[PDB]
Structure 1
Amino acid sequence: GPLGSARRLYVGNIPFGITEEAMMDFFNAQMRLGGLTQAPGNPVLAVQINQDKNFAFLEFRSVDETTQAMAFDGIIFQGQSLKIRRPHVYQPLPGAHKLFIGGLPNYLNDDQVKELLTSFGPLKAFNLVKDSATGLSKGYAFCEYVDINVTDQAIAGLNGMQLGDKKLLVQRAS
């Protein structure tokens, strides 16, 4: 997901013929050896390998252990120095691209508001705020897109949009 991305690392320069399980054993052993684990057990949950382009992704059980594992940049595996980096979609400041959407007609339900939003791309997060007593919409929502690069286009397309007798406010929620 979004913080699915905070638990992954890119690994380059992987040795020829390596298997996903072997990679897993190596990094779990390294984490334990260096005492970088925050709990008993294995920090690396899974590995996906692209053999043709000589890279892999590691998926970790926690955000902090992932960060610790950046320390392994340049580590030797079967005689080769691994390249360790963040995923390109990694967010150093999480929630930075969460949007606030105000000025919604208060009769719109979840599905209807998302339909307005998903015209720019899929969402990973959404919620329409309602009065708990009555279940009536308070007229504002929050969301976050799968691809954070569409955030600013969504704002450009939707902020100020006349919606019935209402005028949308779309901005980063901060």
Structure 2
Amino acid sequence: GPLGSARRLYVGNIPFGITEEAMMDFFNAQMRLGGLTQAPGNPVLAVQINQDKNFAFLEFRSVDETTQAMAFDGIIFQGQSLKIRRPHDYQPLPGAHKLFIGGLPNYLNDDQVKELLTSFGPLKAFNLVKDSATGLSKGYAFCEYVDINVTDQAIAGLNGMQLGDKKLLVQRAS
């Protein structure tokens, strides 16, 4: 559900043969050295390793320390660059990363506007704002990417871009 999986992280590319205790000790040490821990003690409570598919799940004692540990993505552990991700059934709340897109040509329809956006990744929400009586586009839209990490990429790739006689605006809607 909406509040599920908030204290766990997926860790991929773990070093071959590593133990759960070693992984646990490494992350707890890094949390402390890196200044990511928010109270005395160990933020990582447990590590569950799948040796066959070479991945682990970390369980944290708190929601906010789980979030902080996302910053370890790519950290090198016994020669291996670790892949750190949210669990697949973790989701931010609806609208958390809604985008505003302004400066669109009024003659473009929904699908045409969406084509520009979906080049960065799939969308879980989209609406092109139209005049209700005439059905004509007002030249701005909102969207949300399935993968929320795509949000900053769309902004970086589209914001301030030339588009016809306009300069496109793409920013977080709140």
TM-score by length of 1: 0.53
* Preserved contact between residue 27 and residue 44 of structure 2 (Cα < 8 Å): yes
The 3 A distance-change label for structure 1 pair 51 and 160 is same
Q: Which stretches of structure 1, 4 residues or more, deviate above 6 A after TM superposition?
A: 94-174
Quote the Cα distance in structure 2 between the aligned partners of 1:76 and 1:158: 32
**In the alignment, which residue of structure 2 is the partner of 1:114?**
114
Contact conserved, 1:96 with 1:172, CA < 8 A, in 2? no
Give deviations 1:24-46, integer Å, cap 9, x for gaps: 00000000001101100000010
Structure 1 gap ranges (5+): none
Is the contact made by 1:103 and 1:167 (CA closer than 8 Å) also made in structure 2? Answer: yes
After the TM superposition, which residues 1-174 of structure 1 pair with which residues of structure 2 at under 5 Å, given as runs?
3-93=3-93
CA contact (8 A) 1:9 1:85 kept: yes
Matched-pair contact (CA < 8 Å) for 1:6–1:63: yes
CA RMSD of aligned residues (A): 8.9
Q: Do 2:48 and 2:57's aligned partners in 1 also have CA atoms closer than 8 Å?
A: yes
**Retained in 1: the 8 A contact 2:28–2:44?**
yes
Q: For residues 78-111 of structure 1, what are the alpha-carbon distances to aligned partners after superposition, in whole Å with 9 as ceiling and x for unaligned?
A: 0110000000000211899999999999999999
Distance 2:163 2:15 in 1: 56
* Larger helix proportion of the pair: 1
Unaligned runs of 5+ residues in structure 2 are none
> 1:95-152 deviations in whole A, cap 9, x for unaligned?
9999999999999999999999999999999999999999999999999999999999
CA contact (8 A) 1:10 1:55 kept: yes
Taking structure 1 as reference, are residues 98 and 25 closer, same or farther at Cα in structure 2, changes over 3 Å only? same
Per-residue CA shift, 1:7-61, capped at 9, x if unaligned? 0000000011111111000000000001101100000010000000000000000
Q: Calculate the TM-score normalised by the size of structure 2.
A: 0.53
Aligned length: 174
Matched residue SS, 1:27? helix
Residues 4, 89 of structure 2: 8 Å contact kept: no
Q: Does the Cα contact within 8 Å between 2:13 and 2:55 map onto a contact in 1? A: yes
